[PDB]
Paper text:
The ribosome translates nucleotide sequences of messenger RNA to proteins through selection of cognate transfer RNA according to the genetic code. The bacterial ribosome possesses universally conserved functional centers that are structurally dynamic and undergo local and large-scale conformational rearrangements during protein synthesis. In particular, the small (30S) ribosomal subunit, which is responsible for decoding the messenger RNA sequence, undergoes rearrangement of the universally conserved monitoring residues A1492 and A1493 in the decoding center, as well as a large-scale domain closure that involves movement of the body of the whole 30S subunit closer to helix 44.
Here, we report an X-ray crystal structure of the [name] 30S ribosomal subunit decoding complex to 3.45 Å resolution using data obtained at ambient temperature at the Linac Coherent Light Source (LCLS). Microcrystals of the 30S ribosomal subunit were soaked with 80 µM paromomycin, 200µM mRNA, and 200 µM phenylalanine tRNA anticodon stem–loop, ASLPhe oligonucleotide, resulting in a slurry of 2 × 2 × 4 µm3 size 30S decoding complex microcrystals (see “Preparation and crystallization of 30S ribosomal subunits for SFX crystallography at an XFEL” section). The crystal structure of the 30S decoding complex at ambient temperature adopted the canonical decoding conformation, with the h44 residues A1492 and A1493 flipped out toward the minor groove of ASL and mRNA pair, consistent with the cryogenic data. In the structure presented here, the hydrogen bonding interactions of codon residues 1–3 of the hexauridine in the mRNA-ASL complex were markedly similar to those observed in the cryogenic temperature crystal structure, as shown by the clear positive difference density for each base pair in the omit Fo-Fc electron density maps at 3.45 Å resolution. On the other hand, residues 4–6 of the hexa-uridine were disordered and as a result not modeled in the cryogenic structure, while a well-defined electron density was observed in the ambient-temperature structure. The 16S rRNA residue C1397 was captured in a different conformation compared to the prior structure, pointing away from the disordered hexauridine in the cryogenic data set and involved in a stabilizing interaction with the mRNA phosphate group of residue 4 in the ambient-temperature structure. Presumably, the conformation of C1397 adopted at ambient temperature stabilizes the interaction of the 3′ end of the mRNA oligo and as a result decreases the disorder in this region. The comparison of our ambient and cryogenic temperature structures therefore illustrates the intrinsic flexible nature of C1397 even in the presence of tRNA at the A-site. The minimal binding differences observed between the cryogenic and ambient temperature 30S decoding complex structures suggest that ribosomal decoding complexes can be probed at cryogenic temperature and may still be representative of what occurs at ambient temperature.
Numbering used by the authors:
A (entry chain O): 2 to 89
B (entry chain R): 16 to 88
C (entry chain F): 1 to 101
D (entry chain K): 11 to 127
The structure:
RNA sequence: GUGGGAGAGGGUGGUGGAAUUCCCGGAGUAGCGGUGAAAUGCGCAGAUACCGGGAGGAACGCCGAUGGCGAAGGCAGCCACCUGGUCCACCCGUGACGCUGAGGCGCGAAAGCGUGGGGAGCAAACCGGAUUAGAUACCCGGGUAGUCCACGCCCUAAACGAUGCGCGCUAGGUCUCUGGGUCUCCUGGGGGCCGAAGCUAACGCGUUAAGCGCGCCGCCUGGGGAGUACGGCCGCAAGGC
């Protein structure tokens, strides 16, 4: 699964300020954690499509968050990507 | 309509999740090996749901039977 | 690393030496699969509600352990090898849910 | 010529026939009867009277072995079940117990079209 | 975000008992089976019924329900690992980041197709027995594909609530599932029945709208011809759109 200590680790890594639990970056980064863990779950168990649903939904919400940030502050958007390593 | 007795009020403090406690799970099985319905047990939805699984757990172990023969018919 | 409960039902016909060997093998297999044993109940020979391996009795053991989850099904695998052992069932521990309280 | 004097009386009832198998306490059979052992041939074998005659002929066959006490075990739902019971119940044999061991699966096999739904 | 809840939601490995069939042994005799009645069939190479052992395939009785889960198809013995969705309390954080959605992509009961396994029971086709005026059937005895497994196809349906998705507004009573709380009761999510206003051609719907409103998609335009022909795209084919 995903332990609360890993969760705290990534939150605190991406928190804009101490106590930031809800920023765009914290969200995108959490979804990135879950997405990568689910993709690793789906290299095995490629016959489990009901989870694969949850995967498409996660990617979708992450793309909406990134499109939002892209609109509002392209600096933090590129910074986010450069940290997470997404878009390719 | 099971106006003879209800098994829960025929019992005191007990743990529904104890698969190893026979002398109580015994009380929830019928004269055959079958699991009693809520008419007799008087359990609730959640209660009968969990007791079911702990009885099945007990059946695998050989503590409760899967089926019995009917006597006296 | 989670908290489990190993149930073992083995042959009721074993004299003290062979059974002691089997318990030894249980301890050893645990040390090999990383089972920190928190407590143990030895219920011993006990009547079975149906014959298992044609024997109307079985010898019961129970271990509340803590071990890596990723190696649980491996461990059970090993425990099933001994002919003396006729039932293996591993279970995640749970908080007791009480009725008529 | 065994001199058993005590055994088990199996009853296999069905909607087509009723057949009695009388055994030693271990379960090995001594004698037996059914609707076809008596002169009944067609559908009459599935009668409570045919059952009665079958169980009586079984009990009388077993008297020749000097059997007194039996435990009865019924299997199958079908006419003549309870009539074979009552035939043995005062057949001369003493019925020590009646037990219904009719085999039921746990949803094992697919029945014929006849038995589906 | 935090902290708790519930579930046949999904994948993989492992595993438990009942039953059927078959094989072995024991005991035992003249039939069993089956039907409206029968016959075919099976049985003296010893069947049926009965006890003991063994093999294998499939399916999980009671629990179980007017119950739950899921987007749909659909999901039910148990254990473990991996994994999806959801609900509540707290008012903590982000600051309109929202809704819908042509095309696309993924999923998609059964049956059906390719390879390879498996094959107990059931069973299209087929072979018999009956019935009938006939009986290419309904009934009975057999039986191949198939039903099962891995992988790849196929893409349909009375795929049904015959009711697209989201959000706001509009009496209640009651049953139930699952939370929370000052736990007679209050409060949130889900499933039922009856009904206010209202709507409807009627049937009926009625806070789970088929009411009152807004947003976006899909679709209809008399019956037959016809889901046919042609063209195109897809498919191993059947065939699909
Ligand atoms: N999912 C399998 C089932 O899990 C049951 O237990 C399940 C639930 O009771 C339990 O609920 C958990 C829990 O942490 C708490 N109640 C809240 C939490 N959101 C839930 O976790 C949920 O969300 C996550 C993704 O975030 C999913 O991966 C997970 O499947 C889901 N249960 O999580 C478990 C896993 O889903 C039983 N073991 C059994 O019915 C069966 O194994
Ligand atoms: N075996 C448990 C289940 O197996 C599923 O798939 C399993 C089975 O479908 C498949 O066949 C197995 C195998 O041991 C071997 N080929 C033969 C064996 N009889 C089968 O096992 C099972 O078969 C069927 C279901 O198919 C069950 O009804 C039956 O209880 C069981 N014998 O083997 C797979 C595992 O190797 C899924 N993994 C999951 O649902 C679950 O773990
Ligand atoms: K056969
Ligand atoms: K079924
Ligand atoms: K339902
Ligand atoms: K409460
Ligand atoms: K109606
Ligand atoms: Mg969405
Ligand atoms: Mg073993
Ligand atoms: Mg007959
Ligand atoms: Mg499940
Ligand atoms: Mg033999
Ligand atoms: Mg012949
Ligand atoms: Mg001869
Ligand atoms: Mg011959
Ligand atoms: Mg047989
Ligand atoms: Mg046997
Ligand atoms: Mg075979
Ligand atoms: Mg039911
Ligand atoms: Mg739904
Ligand atoms: Mg629903
Ligand atoms: Mg349905
Ligand atoms: Mg606030
Ligand atoms: Mg602010
Ligand atoms: Mg959408
Ligand atoms: Mg589309
Ligand atoms: Mg399909
Ligand atoms: Mg199919
Ligand atoms: Mg095939
Ligand atoms: Mg094949
Ligand atoms: Mg073959
Ligand atoms: Mg064959
Ligand atoms: Mg057949
Ligand atoms: Mg047939
Ligand atoms: Mg014919
Ligand atoms: Mg006619
Ligand atoms: Mg073929
Ligand atoms: Mg449907
Ligand atoms: Mg419908
Ligand atoms: Mg409805
Ligand atoms: Mg519905
Ligand atoms: Mg609607
Ligand atoms: Mg629809
Ligand atoms: Mg939405
Ligand atoms: Mg409601
Ligand atoms: Mg429902
Ligand atoms: Mg109404
Ligand atoms: Mg009105
Ligand atoms: Mg009316
Ligand atoms: Mg509405
Ligand atoms: Mg159209
Ligand atoms: Mg249309
Ligand atoms: Mg026209
Ligand atoms: Mg048309
Ligand atoms: Mg068509
Ligand atoms: Mg064409
Ligand atoms: Mg082609
Ligand atoms: Mg055709
Ligand atoms: Mg063509």
């Amino acid at each position: 699964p995903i332990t609360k200590e890993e969760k705290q680790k990534v939150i605190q890594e991406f928190a804009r300020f101490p106590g930031d639990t809800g920023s765009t970056e914290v969200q995108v980064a959490l979804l990135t954690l879950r997405i990568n863990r689910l993709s690793e779950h789906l290299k095995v168990h490629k016959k489990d499509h009901h989870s694969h649903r949850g995967l498409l939904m996660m990617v979708g919400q992450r793309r909406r968050l990134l499109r939002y940030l892209q609109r509002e502050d392209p600096e933090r958007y590129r910074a986010l990507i450069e940290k997470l390593g997404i878009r390719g | 309509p099971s106006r003879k007795a209800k098994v829960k009020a025929t019992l005191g403090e007990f743990d529904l999740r104890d698969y190893r406690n026979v002398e109580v799970l015994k009380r929830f099985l019928s004269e055959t090996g079958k699991i009693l319905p809520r008419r007799r047990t008087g359990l609730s939805a959640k209660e009968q749901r969990i007791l079911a699984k702990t009885i099945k757990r007990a059946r695998i172990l050989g503590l409760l039977p899967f089926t019995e023969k009917l006597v006296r018919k | 690393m989670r908290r489990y409960e190993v149930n073992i039902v083995l042959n009721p016909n074993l004299d003290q030496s062979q059974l002691a060997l089997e318990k030894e093998i249980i301890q050893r297999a645990l040390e090999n699969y990383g089972a920190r044993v928190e407590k143990v109940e030895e219920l011993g020979l006990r009547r079975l509600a149906y014959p298992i391996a044609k024997d109307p009795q079985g010898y019961f053991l129970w271990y509340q352990v803590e071990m890596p989850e990723d190696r649980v099904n491996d461990l059970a695998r090993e425990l099933r090898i001994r002919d003396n052992v006729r039932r293996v069932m591993v279970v995640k521990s749970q908080e007791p849910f009480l009725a008529n309280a | 010529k065994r001199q058993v004097a005590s055994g088990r009386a199996y009853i296999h009832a069905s909607y087509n026939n009723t057949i009695v198998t009388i055994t030693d306490p271990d379960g090995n059979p001594i004698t037996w009867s059914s609707g076809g052992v008596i002169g009944y041939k067609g559908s009459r074998k599935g009668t409570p009277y045919a059952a009665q005659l079958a169980a009586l002929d079984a009990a009388k066959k077993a008297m020749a072995y000097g059997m007194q006490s039996v435990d009865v075990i019924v299997r199958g739902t079908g006419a003549g079940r309870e009539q074979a019971i009552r035939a043995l119940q005062a057949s001369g044999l003493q019925v020590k117990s009646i037990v219904d061991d009719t085999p039921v699966p746990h949803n094992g096999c697919r029945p014929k079209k006849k038995f589906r739904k």
